[PDB]
From a paper:
The dense glycan shield consisting of 22–23 N-glycosylation sequons per protomer is an essential feature of SARS-CoV-2 S architecture. The glycans have been shown to play intrinsic and extrinsic roles in protein folding, modulating conformational activation and immune evasion. The transition to the ‘up’ state exposures of RBD for the binding to hACE2 is also a prerequisite for S-mediated viral fusion, directly correlating with infectivity. Here, we dissected the role of N354-linked glycosylation, acquired by BA.2.86 sub-lineages, as a RBD conformational control element in attenuating viral infectivity.
To further verify the role of N354 glycosylation in modulating RBD up/down disposition, four additional modified constructs, BA.2.86-T356K, predicted to remove glycosylation at N354, XBB.1.5-K356T and BA.2.75-K356T, predicted to acquire N354 glycan, together with BA.2.86-ins483V as a control, were characterized, and their structural features were compared with the ancestral strain. Thus, we performed all assays under the same condition by using three representative variants (BA.2.86, BA.2.75, and XBB.1.5) with strict controls (loss and gain of N354 glycan). We observed that N354 glycosylation dramatically increased the proportion of the ‘closed’ form from 19% to 79% in BA.2.86, 50% to 75% in BA.2.75, and 45% to 90% in XBB.1.5, making the ‘closed’ form the dominant population. As expected, acquisition of N354 glycosylation generated by the K356T mutation in BA.2 and XBB.1.5 decreased its infectivity, and loss of N354 glycosylation raised by the reverse mutation T356K in BA.2.86 increased its infectivity. Moreover, the binding affinities of the BA.2.86 S-trimers with or without the N354 glycosylation for hACE2 yielded similar results, despite N354 glycosylation promoting the S-trimer ‘RBD-down’ state. Interestingly, the loss of N354 glycosylation through T356K mutation decreased cleavage efficiency and the reversion of S621P moderately increased S cleavage, indicative of BA.2.86 S-trimers being more likely in a postfusion conformation under furin enriched microenvironments. Not surprisingly, either the loss of the N354 glycan or substitution R681P/H in BA.2.86 substantially reduced the cell–cell fusion activity; on the contrary acquisition of the N354 glycan or the mutation H681R based on XBB.1.5 contributed to increased fusion activity. Notably, the N354 glycosylation decreased BA.2.86 immunogenicity by ∼40% in comparison with BA.2.86-T356K, rendering BA.2.86 a relatively lower immunogenicity among SARS-CoV-2 variants.
Residue numbers in the entry:
A (entry chain B): 534 to 677, 689 to 726
B (entry chain A): 727 to 1064
C (entry chain B): 47 to 68, 80 to 138, 158 to 210, 212 to 246, 263 to 436
D (entry chain B): 968 to 1144
E (entry chain C): 534 to 581
F (entry chain C): 727 to 774
The structure:
């Protein structure tokens, strides 16, 4: 059973993950496979004499972005560092360790460079960051009537200077502003 | 100067107990000796975010450079972003990106090709095997170039005004005359030797690129930070291959070979060893983060002083009477051009 | 205080089966069951517990009456309806204050609702209850605590659950508890004013991770997500190397006991199915291993001593025995780690 | 936390077990508790070092923005720095930076120098600014136009190297008197 | 003895401290009690 | 203002197991725990 997470007990070695075809150049005497850091990577099939790699299961980390509970109860889920078509089929086949199942309406899918956001939708506008998601994406609570949106950073208001050969802007007035440093 | 490092967000539960219910139960006796580690690592990640934001997000409005580039003979195409490059990056930043090779980029979603690695799985897949993951940075390495471009545009078309109040335009010749005036030389010298000084600036900007190209490692500080993080991570992963004084090094082997109440001693030994290794790694990460935060504060002060104005303090903005500086983005760092 | 505890609870917004009454199916018991019942005065007396509900395994009966209770862990035969017919292997009769408390404000509108929870971890039957004339439509929505009433060490096996009725001349709210981590909000007077599950909602996971009822705007890293393995493969080398067991049990001239032929079995895989299919055994007693546990243990060397002998001599052949065979023909050491096979 | 022993409370374990078997469990308790204390003290040391760095920065900010005026940009508040008043805070300090920020600005014109009679004139302080018809001098962060006299400018040059030089007349109060 | 540091052995639970009247609300099924961070704090008198 | 501290070059085997082969062997079972210490001490000397 290849290309599927499965517990394997190859000739006494036990582990978890996904195995598939490989293009090693295994020497005939070789039986195991490893890497620089001494982790079992490739296993030769004892009953087929083919080469299969061993993969992690689904590694990532779930992060929840939420507004203040006194404001709203809607929440959105972040699946860090995973192509979330993988979790989409994982949610469908219901082999995910997380038991809380947040809705998937098709519009709440987000292939972020930093993982996948679920429970939020794109807004191609640009607003100042409220909650940092990562990979230049920020979520915030906004009125449509209220939901959780995800959008790219706006580094600031777009401004263009008027540099010229003989142009000077000289302030005719001034202001006094009192800020605070803590 | 480095500004930040990669953000690691290890999970003790699995890093110490690979998908073992009995091992997780045994670890549950050690109290809140995990929530502390996770809180420390997330604090380090947030600290890195604030360091990069403090270093680069110094100006609110993102200025753009005028379409025509003739700043009195000063040639700025080597530091100005190149529209031909799809990443909108300057040629100098191109070399800075090319000369640094990251072992772990983080923004890879590498799951799906560890099975397809064909060859021996690399450091990243190996880390993904034993409870190690890297959180990609908030500020994408592209928008950092945009902030750098905005800062560069502010300091060559508006002088040092945009860091104080509204950005007021000023041509580069009299901006040059003023930076001269702040040192002790009257503007007549610049207005008499403008062609000579422009040729000097062009020659220097030509030579700096070749100096960065031909050197074996002049970016040795950023390379050093990356190598330190990678080496610490690799040692931390390798530590799971030590028996720590028990029968074997594999939890699923000990559990499946020995009975619960006798394998309890060995699994306790493994817990005490692996968790101590994780603690040492977290402490070293804390020290490195403190040093990097100090360097980032120094870099922020350097930016706001040298780039955003003329610094009277000697040797701070390069050796000699300082005139200006241009910022340039780098992987996990910044490069200044005094 | 906002203490967090992990113990077998009923999940929040879980699914509860609601029954009527006008025949009393035997609902399975596993990891406890939450019970609730609303009534005008009374239509329910008690419950019975255990497995197979007959006079073969110990059972339970907790019927109440007007003034006391009738808790007993006995081996009742059957009722099919004077609620038991056997008290032979029966002990531990428990009597205390009646569970059912009924109060009315001079009207039947104050229909009392009663929530009962039972569990059997390491024995020690625990009964939790709280009686109050709630709004009376059905299971309420406002939070209510449960105060344990009795905690008694039954120490028996329970699999099936059943409820008893009354006589006369809208209840049965049944839910199954699950092992979950919970956090409970304690009043300054000590009562539980609120509780949140930690396996239901992402917001619940966040509130649980920080053990607080107010989460400020922001991101919170709560746990790790895993694709659990769907199937489990076991694969071992193609080696078969069947042992000469075939030639030791297909022989035609099994030597006598006085000269017992001893065969050294080495360099083979000891599969015991070829042993099981070859002889309709009559004495397959083992001493150091289990007849069932033989294919999962690995040994250094195996000796197969074969000899045909009489019937009673089969029972004679055993460690620490005596007789004309056990003394002069073949003596089994008291510390023998193996098996004998007689057919 | 039990730390892998019988119980997490010493005053119970000492009376529940005799010494020659209880010393092992109490040693487990000692090692767990002291490892936790080592973690706590290391974290406290790191926090104290960070607080010391912040305190040194705050002390420099005090002695610079309060006991004098800072020419450093973006150190004593955003914009040009004028003054600063300190305020005590719980386990910290709070500043009130008073900063000079310019205001409404207008394009006028500029020229690097003025050539009156074969000689290039440069402003002693400020730039040469033009309404559009009459050239003027002014300060840098405030528009205060002034008549171009011999006092505002110093003359040095030959009117043939300054690119963008602009023709106008300068004045002096000595020819008049 | 109240208001006096004393070695107590209440119901086999050993310790040292000062006993005094408290205004807590122990349930009849409550026996030991505790405080926020897991230390035996208010033990009701088994007799009185 | 201090500028540097005394440079230290502590050694794993010589400090922990003075010339004991069995002790060194059982230290090897602890993995590369202490190579980190040697590298860190080299680092502190370098920064001094
Ligand atoms: C410079 O800017 C000041 C405010 O930023 C101006 O002061 C204002 O004056 C108006 C009336 O002229 C008031 O109504 C207002 O409350 C404020 O005090 C000031 O006039 C301005 N100066 C110039 C020369 O434009
Ligand atoms: C500013 O400096 C640039 C250096 O990157 C000049 O680009 C050059 O273009 C020539 C071809 O015209 C190339 O052969 C050379 O390698 C370099 O890329 C650019 O012309 C120059 N511009 C001005 C106005 O001085
Ligand atoms: C805890 O229990 C106390 C004892 O009854 C309560 O105090 C009482 O409060 C009532 C009003 O509710 C007063 O009338 C009475 O005199 C006494 O002070 C207290 O309220 C209660 N706290 C809770 C339930 O949160
Ligand atoms: C050039 O600068 C002059 C300042 O001296 C402005 O001239 C003013 O014009 C009024 C009448 O038009 C005079 O009464 C006044 O004394 C002053 O000289 C002039 O507006 C300005 N030109 C432009 C185009 O801004
Ligand atoms: C400023 O005024 C000068 C005369 O006072 C001008 O010099 C003239 O230059 C022309 C050639 O451009 C000669 O033919 C003439 O003899 C005289 O030298 C000068 O050009 C002028 N400059 C500007 C910018 O107006
Ligand atoms: C394994 O054994 C079976 C049984 O005869 C045989 O059909 C198969 O070809 C063998 N495969 C290998 C790789 O030895
Ligand atoms: C991850 O991204 C998409 C979505 O799954 C798909 O192309 C593939 O699974 C992965 N691609 C790469 C380049 O890793
Ligand atoms: C609007 O958003 C969509 C994605 O939902 C994007 O493809 C499109 O380019 C956006 N339009 C603009 C003008 O940004
Ligand atoms: C400035 O002058 C140069 C030549 O003198 C010309 O090429 C350029 O276009 C001018 N730019 C502006 C903004 O006037
Ligand atoms: C309870 O049962 C109904 C009908 O069988 C079902 O639709 C519902 O999902 C169940 N409740 C839960 C929480 O699954
Ligand atoms: C109720 O049950 C108790 C249990 O001991 C019993 O003594 C009593 O006779 C029963 N009947 C009444 C009316 O109390
Ligand atoms: C008591 O239990 C034994 C063992 O199960 C059983 O054989 C016997 O019949 C029981 N006594 C009865 C039912 O009276
Ligand atoms: C001997 O082997 C044959 C061939 O498999 C089998 O049919 C027969 O039952 C065996 N007899 C004994 C006594 O093992
Ligand atoms: C200067 O002129 C340019 C030309 O368009 C204009 O955009 C800019 O706003 C002007 N600056 C001012 C009025 O301060
Ligand atoms: C003895 O214990 C019983 C139990 O309730 C009770 O009478 C009382 O607590 C004690 N009697 C005394 C102290 O005289």
């Amino acid at each position: 059973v290849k290309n599927k997470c499965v517990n394997f007990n190859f000739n006494g070695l036990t582990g978890t993950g996904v195995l598939t075809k490989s293009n090693k150049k295994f020497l005939p005497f070789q039986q195991f496979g490893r890497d620089i850091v001494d982790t079992t990577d490739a296993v030769r099939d004892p009953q087929t004499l083919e080469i299969l790699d061993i993969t992690p299961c689904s590694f990532g980390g779930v992060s929840v972005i939420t507004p203040g509970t006194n404001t709203s109860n809607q929440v959105a889920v972040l699946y860090q560092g995973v192509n979330c078509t993988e979790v989409s089929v994982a949610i469908h086949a219901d082999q995910l360790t997380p038991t809380w199942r947040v809705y998937s309406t098709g519009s709440n899918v987000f292939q972020t460079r930093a993982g996948c956001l679920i429970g939020a939708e794109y807004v191609n506008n640009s607003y100042e960051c409220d909650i940092p998601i990562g990979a230049g994406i920020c979520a915030s609570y906004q009125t449509q009537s209220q939901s959780i949106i995800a959008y790219t950073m706006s580094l600031g208001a777009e401004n263009s200077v008027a540099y010229s050969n003989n142009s000077i802007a000289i302030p005719t007035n001034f202001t006094i502003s009192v800020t605070t440093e803590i | 100067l480095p500004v930040s490092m990669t953000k690691t967000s290890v999970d003790c539960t699995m890093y110490i107990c690979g998908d073992s219910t009995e091992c997780s139960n045994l670890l549950l006796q050690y109290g809140s000796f995990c929530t502390q580690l996770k809180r420390a690592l997330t604090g380090i990640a947030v600290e890195q975010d604030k360091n990069t934001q403090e270093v680069f997000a110094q100006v609110k409005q993102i200025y753009k450079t005028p379409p025509i580039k003739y700043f009195g003979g000063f040639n700025f195409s080597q530091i100005l972003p190149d529209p031909s490059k799809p990443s909108k990056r300057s040629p100098i930043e191109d070399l800075l990106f090319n000369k640094v090779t990251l072992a772990d980029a983080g923004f890879i979603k590498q799951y799906g090709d560890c099975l397809g690695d064909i060859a021996a799985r690399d450091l990243i897949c190996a880390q993904k095997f034993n409870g190690l993951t890297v959180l990609p940075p908030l500020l994408t390495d592209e928008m950092i170039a945009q902030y750098t471009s905005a800062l560069l545009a502010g300091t060559i078309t508006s002088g040092w005004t945009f860091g104080a109040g509204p950005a007021l335009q000023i041509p580069f010749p009299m901006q040059m005359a003023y930076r001269f005036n702040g040192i002790g030389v009257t503007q007549n010298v610049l207005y008499e030797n403008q062609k000579l000084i422009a040729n000097q600036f062009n020659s220097a900007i030509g030579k700096i690129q070749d100096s960065l190209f031909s050197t074996p490692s002049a970016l040795g500080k950023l390379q050093d930070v990356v190598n330190h993080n990678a080496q610490a991570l690799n040692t931390l992963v390798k530590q799971l291959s030590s028996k720590f004084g028990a029968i074997s090094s594999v939890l699923n082997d000990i559990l499946s070979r020995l009975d619960p109440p006798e394998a309890e001693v060995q699994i306790d030994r493994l817990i005490t060893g692996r968790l101590q290794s994780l603690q040492t790694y977290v402490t070293q990460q804390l020290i490195r983060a403190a040093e990097i935060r100090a360097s980032a504060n120094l870099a922020a002060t350097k930016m706001s002083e040298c780039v955003l104005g003329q610094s009277k303090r000697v040797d701070f903005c390069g050796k000699g009477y300082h005139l200006m500086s241009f910022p340039q983005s780098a992987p996990h760092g910044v490069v200044f051009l005094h | 205080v906002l203490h967090l505890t992990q113990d077998l609870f009923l999940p929040f917004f879980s699914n509860v089966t609601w029954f009527h009454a006008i025949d009393n199916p035997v609902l399975p018991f596993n990891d406890g069951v939450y019970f609730a019942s609303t009534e005008k005065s009374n239509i329910i007396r008690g419950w019975i517990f255990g497995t197979t509900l007959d006079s073969k395994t110990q059972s339970l009966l907790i019927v109440n009456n007007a003034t006391n209770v009738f808790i007993k862990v006995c081996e009742f035969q059957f009722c099919n309806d004077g609620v038991y017919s056997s008290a032979n292997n029966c002990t531990f009769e428990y009597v205390s204050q009646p569970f059912l408390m009924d109060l009315e404000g001079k009207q039947g509108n104050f229909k009392n609702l009663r929530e009962f929870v039972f569990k059997n971890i390491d024995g020690y039957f625990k009964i939790y209850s709280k009686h109050t004339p709630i709004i009376g439509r059905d299971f309420p929505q406002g939070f209510s605590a449960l105060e344990p009433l009795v905690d008694l060490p039954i120490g028996i096996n329970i699999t099936r659950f059943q409820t008893l009725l009354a006589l006369n001349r809208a209840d049965y709210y049944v839910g199954y508890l699950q092992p979950r981590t919970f956090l409970l909000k304690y009043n300054e007077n000590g009562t539980i004013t609120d509780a949140v599950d930690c396996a239901l909602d992402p917001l619940s996971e966040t509130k649980c991770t920080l053990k607080s009822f107010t989460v400020e705007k922001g991101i919170y890293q709560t746990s790790n997500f895993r694709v659990q393995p769907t199937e489990s493969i076991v694969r071992f080398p193609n080696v078969t190397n069947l042992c000469p067991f075939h030639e030791v049990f297909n022989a035609t001239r099994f030597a006598s006991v006085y000269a017992w032929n001893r065969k050294r079995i080495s360099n083979c895989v000891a599969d015991y199915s070829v042993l099981y299919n070859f002889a309709p055994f009559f004495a397959f007693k083992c001493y150091g291993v289990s007849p069932t546990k033989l294919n999962d243990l690995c040994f250094t060397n195996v000796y197969a001593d074969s000899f045909v002998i009489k019937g009673n001599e089969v029972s004679q052949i055993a460690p620490g025995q005596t007789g004309n065979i056990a003394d002069y023909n073949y003596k089994l050491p008291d510390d023998f780690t193996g098996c004998v096979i007689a057919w | 936390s039990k730390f892998g022993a019988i119980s997490s409370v010493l005053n119970d374990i000492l009376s529940r077990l005799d010494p020659p078997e209880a010393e092992v469990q109490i040693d487990r308790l000692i090692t767990g508790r002291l490892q936790s204390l080592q973690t706590y003290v290391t974290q406290q040391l790191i926090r104290a070092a960070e607080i010391r760095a912040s305190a040194n920065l705050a002390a420099t900010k005090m002695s610079e923005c309060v006991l004098g005026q800072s020419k450093r940009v973006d150190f004593c508040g955003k914009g040009y720095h004028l003054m600063s008043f300190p305020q005590s805070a719980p386990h910290g300090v709070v500043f009130l930076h008073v900063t000079y920020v310019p205001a409404q600005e207008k394009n006028f014109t500029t020229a690097p120098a003025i050539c009156h009679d074969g000689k290039a004139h440069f402003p002693r302080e400020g730039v040469f600014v033009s309404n559009g018809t009459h050239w003027f001098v002014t300060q840098r962060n405030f528009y205060e136009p002034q008549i171009i006299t011999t006092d505002n400018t110093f003359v040095s040059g030959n009117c043939d190297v300054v690119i963008g030089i602009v023709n106008n007349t300068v004045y002096d109060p000595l020819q008049l008197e």
